[PDB]
C-alpha cells in the first residue's frame, strides 16, 4: 500500500534495538555458560568467548 510508514517505524525500532542487542553481545562476551543450542540439533559452540 504505497510503502506504508509502519515499515519504517518498525525499521527504526530495529536499529534502536540494535543497541540492546549489542549490550547482549557484551554480556555473552563476559559470561553466560558452556551450554549449547536447540536449533535443529543438540550441541553448538559456547558463546563465552566469541
Amino acid at each position: 500500500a504505497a510503502e506504508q510508514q509502519i515499515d519504517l517505524i518498525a525499521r527504526m525500532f530495529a536499529e534502536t534495538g540494535v543497541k540492546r542487542l549489542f549490550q547482549l553481545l557484551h554480556d555473552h562476551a563476559i559470561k553466560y555458560q558452556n551450554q549449547e543450542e536447540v536449533f535443529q540439533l543438540r550441541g553448538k559452540w559456547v558463546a563465552v568467548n566469541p
Partner: protein, 47 residues
C-alpha cells in the same frame, strides 16, 4: 566494486539510517543537513 564499497559504507557502518533520516529532518526545516566525515584508527590486534 566502488559502488558496492560505497553502499557497504552506507549500511552497517555508521549508526544505521539515523544519519540518512536526520538528513531530511534537518534539510526540510533548518534548510541544511551537514555531516562530518572523518577517518579514525581501529585496534584489537594480538594481545
Amino acid at each position: 566494486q566502488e559502488t558496492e564499497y560505497v553502499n557497504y559504507l552506507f549500511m552497517r557502518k555508521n549508526e544505521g539510517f539515523k544519519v540518512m533520516f536526520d538528513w531530511f529532518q534537518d534539510t526540510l526545516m533548518m534548510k541544511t543537513g551537514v555531516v562530518k566525515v572523518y577517518v579514525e584508527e581501529v585496534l584489537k590486534p594480538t594481545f
